[PDB]
Enzyme design. Structure first.
Site, short mmCIF file in Angstrom:
data_model
loop_
_atom_site.label_atom_id
_atom_site.label_comp_id
_atom_site.label_asym_id
_atom_site.label_seq_id
_atom_site.Cartn_x
_atom_site.Cartn_y
_atom_site.Cartn_z
N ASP B 269 26.35 28.05 10.65
CA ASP B 269 25.89 27.13 9.63
C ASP B 269 26.95 26.06 9.37
O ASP B 269 27.95 26.33 8.71
CB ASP B 269 25.59 27.91 8.35
CG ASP B 269 25.09 27.03 7.22
OD1 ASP B 269 24.24 26.15 7.49
OD2 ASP B 269 25.53 27.23 6.07
N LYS B 271 27.32 22.01 8.03
CA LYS B 271 26.64 20.89 7.38
C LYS B 271 27.53 20.16 6.35
O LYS B 271 28.61 20.65 6.02
CB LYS B 271 25.32 21.38 6.74
CG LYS B 271 25.38 22.72 6.02
CD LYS B 271 23.97 23.18 5.63
CE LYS B 271 23.99 24.40 4.72
NZ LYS B 271 22.63 24.97 4.52
N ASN B 274 28.56 21.89 3.30
CA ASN B 274 29.54 22.88 3.75
C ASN B 274 30.80 22.23 4.36
O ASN B 274 31.40 22.76 5.30
CB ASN B 274 28.89 23.87 4.73
CG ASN B 274 28.14 25.00 4.03
OD1 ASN B 274 27.67 24.86 2.90
ND2 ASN B 274 28.03 26.14 4.71
#
Lengths: 478, 466
Positions: B269, B271, B274
């Site tokens: 994950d 992004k 993030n």
């Protein structure tokens, strides 16, 4: 100026070597930090970073500050010290002693105040230094002290004089750059007279004492032709040099000039006799003056030692006039044959003649005048000097103010020292009353020369490192 | 500002205690001074008073000075370093003359002195003071720094180390909810690798403790906000970022993932939200639930989880996938950086996860006018429909990536150091659980702790001599 190549043979060591030192040394509190300034300072330095013993450190600091303080600021430094540590919740009020010594000091004199902190400071808090860094570095400073500092390490160029034993010099410690009078002796002439015993007795007590009215020995080594012993330099000349030949038509000295020297002597003899030791021969020509103006006492053939358990010692030798009455007949005499000698010296200081004689007789009339004749004084004396010299020149030793109670605490009271408070002279801060003008062999012998040579004498060595900055500039952290 | 009462519980100890340390630790040269800055400095300090190893010290100093040097003064610092050591006046005399030929790029020059400096001269430090003080600095590191030692006020939190006064994001977890989901294994794996790494593109963990309600883990400060905060809500009518702004961040990411994958580890994950931005303007990557570990001897790992769009094509079907699902995620991120929308979708269009998966796999990227060609030629690489043609983790580092056209201005050194002016400065319980909470809590994580002492002056002001 400074040398490099000899300063290069002096490095800070590792830690696998300071293990033979750990067991064989046994310095109880007293023998280490309180006396050894590199200990003093390193342990000072331990109390500096460790924040809990600031108040106790500065306490003791300001006690040494008041100890030496002047005589119109003692009331003020007292009211300064009393307001900082003693009373209704002080801001550096320490919390390890109870409150029994707080009562003790309230009268004056803060001497018992000091020993109250010392006792404790050497017990519970003292455990840590030992198991901490600062101490270890001391081991390494200590390590390098236990080293062979031979003939290579000192220089010769100008000589003091010549009596007989050998040739007396001034010598500079090359690496650091500190000066020292190092007395040198023709070995062959030494064994030629069985003059072994008068010198070693003289050596054994030099390294054991550090009184700035006594030539403080720093080192001891063997060259090849000569044996040597570094001691704390003295230039201009001796006291006779001054008494008789400084100012001709004004012979002798003034009043504060003789007083200042007489006091410095009082404390030198105190140290002499604190260790049970006699000088016997005490006179002006056997007293010197340095460039700084603080005197000492010199030439120590007549430096007999008293042992342990015994009371007195006998003989016949010295100098006619500076022998005591009980020294001339040949009886058992205490140290005050020196104090009797001092009386004669103090007279010849402020008289330009021997006390009984006229200036410049055989030794029988000199002995008869040593015992019987009293002192006939003229107009030049002040009364404090006359009342005091009558004590030293008594015809027996029990009425003469000799070594009593362990120190000259009974002497120091005497009227002649009102101006002089009995502290500053022991330190070295008083402006002296005259500054000078400046500019084949067997085994028994070679085994002795290396016994004789114990390399270093510890504390003046320590002082050399701290005063010269040698301590300061290799004790580096950044 | 500074606190006193908590700075008071921190004293320099005696020496009868640093004996249980002597045997149980076995730091070979590499693990100590070269990496541990309090070791570094103390040993530096050993070579500072010991006069015979000045030339070797300053040698290495000026190598770190040239390592980070700018790019019109490297020719000069070279001619400065070549004139000083290569009969030079700080010409050292312990190595022979085989590495003098080598350098005539001075990287092999450095390892020549290191090798030796860690052997014959290194013996002394050990049997000398400076090291011992380290033992005592080390001693106080091996201590229990609990909930008392940190503060909370603004929120996951930011927390100040009370005594020193250093800031830290300390992630806090409701214990009962943790055991409520068997979420033990994803967190400890995540913890075990945090303390083992110090890369300034990776949240560097400093501490680990147990309160009562929560378990915590201090990691390195970031203020302003995350990248979505900026992408969408910094400048409204001018959505997204400029060209050197997105580039600067994309590069910092490239090296963070390099460190991620050098140790065989996945992020999955990846992004904007993030990714954070500090007061100084150097970004990092954050929130590591999705931080699965790859073991030793195995090739790949499987599953189904992440974020629709930043999953890879081979991640959505549920197959065996390499790290480049991150690099695929990065491509989507870099787009959403300089687009203000998901790459396939329209902005904020709430489609389901089936069409988002069908657009994750099949649909290519339809670019508009705003893109420069270097960005278009590069994003076509990350957004490929398979992982073998997408420039993933190859050869052990992104040495094939770093060549790519989009980084001409940026020379691949200064960003790894931290000297480039960033393009925007800001304004009831059983036994198995309580035995685990104290296992979990290993008190300290050593090196960021060491850094805290040196940077805050805490090292400097209790390492006193006078």
């Amino acid at each position: 100026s400074r040398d490099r190549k000899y300063l290069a043979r002096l490095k800070l060591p590792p830690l696998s070597k300071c293990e033979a030192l750990r067991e064989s040394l046994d310095l109880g509190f007293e023998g280490m930090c309180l006396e050894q300034p590199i200990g003093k300072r390193l342990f000072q330095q331990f109390l500096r970073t460790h924040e809990q013993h600031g108040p106790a450190l500065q306490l003791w600091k300001d006690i040494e500050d008041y100890d030496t303080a002047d005589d119109a600021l003692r009331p003020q430094k007292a009211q300064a010290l009393r307001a900082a540590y003693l009373e209704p919740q002080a801001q550096l009020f320490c919390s390890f002693l109870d409150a029994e010594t707080v009562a003790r000091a309230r009268a004056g004199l803060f001497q018992p105040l000091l020993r109250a902190v010392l006792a404790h400071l050497g017990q519970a808090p003292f455990q840590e230094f030992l198991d901490s860094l600062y101490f270890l570095r001391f081991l390494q400073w200590k390590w390098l002290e236990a080293q062979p500092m031979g003939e290579d390490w000192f220089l010769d160029f100008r000589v003091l004089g010549r009596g007989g034993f050998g040739e007396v010099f001034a010598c500079q410690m090359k690496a650091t750059g500190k000066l020292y009078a190092c007395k040198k002796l023709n070995k062959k002439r030494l064994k030629k007279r069985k003059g072994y015993q008068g010198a070693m007795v003289e050596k054994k007590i030099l390294a054991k004492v550090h009184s700035r009215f006594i030539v403080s020995l720093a080192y001891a080594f063997e060259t090849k032709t000569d044996l040597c012993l570094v001691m704390t330099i003295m230039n201009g000349g001796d006291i006779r040099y001054h008494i008789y030949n400084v100012d001709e038509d004004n012979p002798g000295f003034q009043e504060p000039r003789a007083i200042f020297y007489t006091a410095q002597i009082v404390s030198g003899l105190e140290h002499l006799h604190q260790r049970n030791i006699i000088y016997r021969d005490l006179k002006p020509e056997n007293v010197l003056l340095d460039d700084d103006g603080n005197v000492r006492i010199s030439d120590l053939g007549l430096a007999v030692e008293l042992k342990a358990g015994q009371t007195k010692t006998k003989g016949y030798a010295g100098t006619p006039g500076f022998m005591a009455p009980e020294l001339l007949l040949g009886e058992e005499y205490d140290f005050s044959v020196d104090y009797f000698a001092l009386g004669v010296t103090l007279y010849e200081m402020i008289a330009a003649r021997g006390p009984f004689r006229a200036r410049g007789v055989e030794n029988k009339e000199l002995k008869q005048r040593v015992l019987e004749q009293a002192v006939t004084y003229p107009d030049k004396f002040s009364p404090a000097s006359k009342d005091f010299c009558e004590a030293l020149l008594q015809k027996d030793p029990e009425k003469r103010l000799g070594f009593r109670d362990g120190s000259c605490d009974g002497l120091r009271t005497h009227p002649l020292f009102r101006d002089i408070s009995w502290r500053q002279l022991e330190a070295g801060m008083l402006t002296p009353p005259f500054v000078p003008d400046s500019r084949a062999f067997e085994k028994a012998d070679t085994e002795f020369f290396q016994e004789f040579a114990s390399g270093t004498c510890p504390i003046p060595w320590q002082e050399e490192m701290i005063e010269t900055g040698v301590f300061g500039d290799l004790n580096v952290w950044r």
